[PDB]
Design a protein around this ligand. Structure first.
Ligand SMILES: [Mg+2]
Ligand SMILES: [Mg+2]
Ligand SMILES: [Zn+2]
Ligand SMILES: [Zn+2]
Lengths: 325, 338
């Protein structure tokens, strides 16, 4: 089923994938994989790919932000980077395939809480993963492996030994890179690559670009219009404040951004965009000139947040004409 | 005409039957139902001995009280309950501050009557709006200033000149002229601009000491007391000051919306898109309210509690200001408000 039949704007950076109905996202996944040629290129079995994608979608829970629609929109951005940035000029085909597959699986079985929360609550996930770090990301990867090994879901089962091993190592590294702590950890290396210039002969640069691109996809809701950033802030903060409510109950001090009594959304949001999102799309711009508009949308969305911040102070009366609050 | 019939024929209820705390500074007259206010006016008049001392005709007094009440419209703040609450505070001053040591009986009577009448036919807009909107009131009075206040006074006289309502009609020519002059100065003194012009003279008066034998002192004291009555909602508890804030800004923001439709830029305190209520309230407490009650305390020591309540109410606004900034998400979990 052609990509062009979904919407004429599907491969544009202007397109908002969350506007696609959730019942159509699975075929949109197949259409993107076909449009990138990975089906014919790696001789993926069609019914297996079909069963795989349904398993991935079924593997997501329903918290406000970390759900299938997020995994879906992250994958679509990966497709957008393929179609708009000519990724084949920088990475091998298997690496692009791996990135896209990893985008689908990257938040599997997310519970709407961060890594710190898993450890503090002494969950099973923490017992299993806290000593290696990146608790939730190790779980996501493990859920992805458990899916691959379900009957009729292994899309790599015909791959050669070398290609099978490459896909698995790539998926692990890429899903692990989705811990923002990892991104911050490697930020200096990403800058160094961007300054010396990308070297496609350098396997180290391949890994680093894969990390940045993955991160760029995870944060891609910031690169659309105002409506998307506003809506996504609503979902993220609802999730944060729900975590903070659990922590307060445990007799723990939540961080400021998870404390609904104390959190000031405009400052948190502007800080997130100034100090995390923008420098990421700034690095992408340095490496890929065609990514310029991404960085420009983010900065523009940033200005919109500042221009709107004054609405968080109550001027005049509330609408009921009452001071009962 | 049954309201008049009952006011005249049922007899004046004893003031202590209204509430057990009726004569206390802590009492909040706005808790009295509006249907009970005319009789409470009669009760206060009786407890102060004015009806007997001035031989006020009962049918005339009843018609007068009802005509005054009906002379108020119903904007959110400047209505009959405001007038009633200002009168009641005048009464509190009488029962608590021993005013008969400072003022003649006729000045005290004039003060109370002036209180009932001081905001008559208020239309919910201020002096500046009368001039800018080219109102009939400004056509009559703008050249002299205190536009609304001149109108309130004029309305008071029109009620007195209504047949069967002149409660002063038997007074001598001298005493009649005296009452109407007192009402004029007192009602005109309810213009904040006037209060600000005489503030230094009030300060000097309280510094040198009140001289009962100084006519100018009597005049200054009357102005200060009238201003104290007009602002008296601030001397009650937090709930009163809060509710009163809501009424006043509802009235102010409505004016502001009109100025906007006329193509003028409204005062910040009138502008519902700019007004930040806690700052405006705190400023009013600091610059207007607190110094008035501090002067009252300087002249009458037993007024100390009034200043303390206003100072306390100013602290409460400071303590509550944080709630005007939205922390977390709004209650619907939506950023739809943008
Ligand atoms: Mg994640
Ligand atoms: Mg007035
Ligand atoms: Zn994610
Ligand atoms: Zn008044």
């Amino acid at each position: 089923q052609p990509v062009a039949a979904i919407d004429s704007n599907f491969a544009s950076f202007t397109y908002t994938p969350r506007s696609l109905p959730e019942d159509d996202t699975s075929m949109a996944i197949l259409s993107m994989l076909q449009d990138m040629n990975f089906i014919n290129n790696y001789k993926i079995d069609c019914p297996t790919l079909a069963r795989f994608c349904l398993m991935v979608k079924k593997g997501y829970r329903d918290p406000p932000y970390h759900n299938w629609m997020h995994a879906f929109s992250v994958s679509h951005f990966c497709y957008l980077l393929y179609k708009n940035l000519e990724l084949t000029n920088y990475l091998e085909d298997i690496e692009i395939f791996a990135l896209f597959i990893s985008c689908m699986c990257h938040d599997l079985d997310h519970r709407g809480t961060n890594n710190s929360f898993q450890v503090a609550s002494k969950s099973v996930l923490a017992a299993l993963y806290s000593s290696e770090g990146s608790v939730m990301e190790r779980h996501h990867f493990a859920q992805a492996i458990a899916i691959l090994n379900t009957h009729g879901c292994n899309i790599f089962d015909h791959f050669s030994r070398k290609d099978y091993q490459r896909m698995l190592d790539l998926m692990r590294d890429i899903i692990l890179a989705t811990d923002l702590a990892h991104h911050l950890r490697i930020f200096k290396d990403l800058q160094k690559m961007a300054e010396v210039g990308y070297d496609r002969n350098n396997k180290q640069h391949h890994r680093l670009l894969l990390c940045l691109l993955m991160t760029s996809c995870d944060l891609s809701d910031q690169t659309k219009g105002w409506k998307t950033t506003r809506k996504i802030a609503e979902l993220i903060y609802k999730e944060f404040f729900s975590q903070g409510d659990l922590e307060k109950a445990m007799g723990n001090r939540p961080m400021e951004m998870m404390d609904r009594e104390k959190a000031y959304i405009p400052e948190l949001q502007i800080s997130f965009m100034e100090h995390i999102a923008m420098p990421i799309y700034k690095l992408l711009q340095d490496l890929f000139p065609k990514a310029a508009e991404l960085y420009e949308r983010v900065a523009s969305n940033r200005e919109h947040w500042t221009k709107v911040s004054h609405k968080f102070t109550i001027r005049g009366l509330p609408s009921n004409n009452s001071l009962d609050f």
